[PDB]
Design an enzyme around this catalytic site. Structure first.
Site: not given
Lengths: 325, 325, 325, 325
Positions: B60, B13, B93-94, B166, B27, B287
């Protein structure tokens, strides 16, 4: 006179126990009965007339839609009586956001329905359950609490079923709603209310569980680098009616995920894009397939999607639900 | 003299654009070239000698292990030269937390490797990209930054690739490490370092990508009420070497999930139990089946698990990695 | 063999009591002796060899520089012996950040010094004190804890005396360091360290209390709309050596405050501009009078300013301290 | 048709400027006129019919009660007209919580009153002011916004004047209400409302500024170790009507502070105990002097106390205000 509160027990860590007081992990949840819990905090009996009922006794990771559906019907029954002013439901922490939200959407009463849980076993040094239970009863019996939707009470905080979630794997202060805050807090035995959620719920909800015996099948798929497409094929091939996608960022999809979603769509499966991030709004995007979950996280989004499908499968109507509930 | 910084662009972005200055969603990411970005903030050229290199240009969510592996090797090459003091990587950013953590474990240098991203398109009113990039270069060129592991710089904060994530689908202040805080902050053009992570990384890591051409296959499955067992079957049947489980609470499993995990185990698949909550420690539990992810979240846990498998399949050694990296 | 830990008690809510188990406010702090506390959690004796010493027994709002100075000297004495591996200090919550930071700067040893407090009286339902104390001893006796500076342990978290502060008037999870996170957490009886503060402290500090019998006088004045100038006059006229200003935003001053500061300056009073906000950096500004506190909050800034004055009055050197301690 | 929004400018960083685009500190606030701001973001004119009015142009640390009082009367005038649908007030960040809360209590209209600020100068790279202003106008013109009390809009968040506060000295995301969350958020040009405050305000408030020409004198004193008593003497001796005490923990007082408060009380001064911590409830305590501020922080508590004194000096009535406003 004292209000009449019923304490429905479902199990959970709040009723768990371990061999030693220093053991806070690896204990057995849903090991104690509601009456043992009630007698542990006798003070509770000065705040209200309590009656414990044992609905179940399991670790919440094993709670299922069937049971949650019956739980919801049982609470509607109780709230319909005149000798019942409120209900406190002891539940596990792991999936309390799921059960609490389901009831937030299906209980047809203004009377308080308060979920209480605990992060430490009842046999633990400094167990949080006793005070949490005490606070839950207090909130349930206060008339200021009516009409606020279903609530989760723990660690002196009162959270809305719609926003509250378990944010930490294992701290006492795990329950928070980062962007939405708490409905109120309980300090020094006085309740301080601060917010009212601006969403539809309880008596103003269109979802009705009276008459249902089973719920639509909805699964959650994760979004990450190299996320496979075959998982979508698998879900479809297993008759899921809806798919909640815990996507990267704001419900972003990879080329593989887009392929899988298109496929699910041409097969009649409803696709709801949510986020894996943990908070925030997944905004509408016409460039991408499926609906968007507004601020609902994966776990809550699955609950509202299951219920929405018990009414319609119209994308336009379901998207509306997600912006209002 | 000014330090020599290379700006490797991968898209995102921070290089995206929309038709209007008020369009912050929908976008097109990875639309502008590194040089357009560099010229937008000329001031950058007074902080260092910059050279832009266009590694790729994508959103991304479509970044893959293959591309990240090559990115890692490219950065090792550049850092090996004497005329390169640091590297700034523009990324989406993703999935920046995934790529940044991969390089955190495989870059064999003490020189600064800084990831920078942006939540708003470059064509947006109040776009955060310019100042983020400026701050990134400043951090990359400062000698105080050596030996701190890979860093992510955005919104005046410097976060460790190991803790940062994020947390909000779409706010500017989305990147946080709730329990671990930031390594430092950039206020008024001065850098304030406050922490050093107490984990192994970069030059003290055992993972080496020089020589690899592909990575092990690892998937992530979600934990929730009524979670299906068939998704485990599906993953196994598709040759995954490991499975990261984004569990309820502290990596809790339902009876269905336990069945699926046991099955994956008798098939040679490594099972890593993590948490869907978002923060916290998944403690050991004999366990239950599988390994535990310490404080690694699903996305990070998948990256460390993929790398661990390029070295061993010994459950005992992998569990060690998860507590030290 | 078990490590030798000394438990120095100073009072506080962790040693407080009320008439009923449901009374969490209006109780009497510093009411129980260290031995009563030790016997409440016998398990502690399996983690180490403990010896309790009663230093004082008061509510922390009444703790003073004199007592803190002696406390600091007492701890230096104990840490100098070979039969003492660590010290746990029970203290009130209200001013623990001040006492803990004072010792963070004056204890000349690498041995663990852990402060522990509690938000609920010892006689309360779900009192947090027992588990806090248990965790404190565990941290104090672990060799991984050496050289980390003074620590505050409460609610499963380990915080640095330099960053930690009480952020909520009355919740259990009140202690946090929003931008700096925690040094580590204690989950399931295992300690997970995540950060090391990048500041000077303990054995690398220049401050020495051996030999001092009194400290310089430093006051804190608040910044707000219509803040009066006369409070500066008052402070000056009462012989204060320094003034910590809890300013609006980033240490911003009104015309009235500027007048008061200039006056204090021409009177030989050192002026330290901090912030009332609660977090963040007060950056340098030549347009304004006084020094800036870096990320030190009013309470911490007063402690460092008092100690700095026992060494110099050089504005240039004090400003240096504030950026490194 | 477009709504009629008036933009009242008071100064602040949102209208500040520095010599270079990289200068974010030490700039001059209140340097640009409202029209320069309006022309910077022309898009604003498609969301509504805007009219800018320059009420003042100062740095908010210099805002005073006199000016805030006139500002409040000016806004009541504007809102009374039929050709005004909402008001946006550009203000500095430092004391916006004070001015916004004052108006929250004295504006007699359901029409939106939105305060907007900015952390970066208008001349800064990535200045936040433009988008903040754009969002403020959008919120002001939306009919969903009526009756929500006064709001502060910044960084995509919408906060209530009653809960919102500046928590960080200098980050963009500084404004938060930790326990109360935001009223809503603005993502992708759509407004998402989530809460309604459960307090009295605007049209349901008893405070009236029409007719007032001056406000009672109220000061704030800080609580810390060794806090002096002479500061109380000073305040009294200067004719303050009330004293807001930013105390340690839950409004805890030292013996010196108690002496000072008793003195202020026998002199007719109203004492309001608040907290320095930053969040939380200061509960009632009969063992201690003065009233308690509920969840009001020092800055807000001073505002409500000034107004309360313009109606009564009855302790019982003032304590009521603090629990309802």
């Amino acid at each position: 006179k004292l209000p009449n509160i019923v304490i429905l027990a479902t199990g959970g860590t709040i009723a768990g126990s371990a061999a030693t007081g220093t053991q806070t992990t690896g204990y057995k949840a849903g090991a104690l009965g509601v009456d043992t819990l009630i007698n542990a905090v006798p003070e509770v009996k000065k705040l209200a007339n309590v009656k414990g009922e044992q609905f179940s006794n399991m670790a919440s990771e094993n709670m299922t839609g069937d049971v949650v559906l019956k739980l919801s019907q049982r609470v509607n029954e109780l709230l319909a009586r005149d000798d019942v002013d409120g209900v406190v439901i002891t539940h596990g922490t792991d999936t309390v956001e799921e059960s609490a939200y389901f009831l937030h959407l299906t209980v047809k009463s203004d009377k308080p329905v308060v979920f209480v849980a605990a992060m430490r076993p009842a046999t633990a040094i400094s167990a949080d359950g006793p005070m949490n239970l005490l606070e839950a009863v207090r909130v349930a019996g206060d008339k200021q609490s009516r009409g606020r939707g279903v609530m989760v009470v723990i660690n002196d905080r009162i959270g809305s079923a719609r926003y509250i979630t378990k944010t930490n794997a294992s701290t006492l202060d795990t329950f928070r709603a980062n962007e939405e805050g708490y409905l109120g807090v309980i300090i020094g035995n006085r309740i301080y209310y601060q917010n009212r959620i601006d969403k539809l719920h309880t008596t103003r909800s269109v979802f009705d569980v009276r008459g249902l015996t089973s719920l639509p099948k909805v699964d959650i798929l994760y979004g990450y680098q190299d996320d496979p497409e075959y998982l979508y094929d698998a879900a479809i091939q297993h008759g899921v009616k809806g798919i909640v996608y815990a996507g990267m960022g704001a419900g972003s999809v990879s080329v593989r995920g887009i392929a899988g979603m298109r496929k699910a769509l041409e097969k009649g499966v409803v696709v709801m894009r949510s986020t894996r991030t943990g908070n925030g709004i997944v905004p509408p995007d016409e460039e991408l397939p499926g609906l968007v979950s507004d601020s609902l996280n994966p776990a809550h989004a699955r609950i509202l999607l299951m219920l929405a499908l018990t009414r319609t499968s119209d994308p336009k109507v379901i998207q509306e639900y997600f912006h209002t509930y």
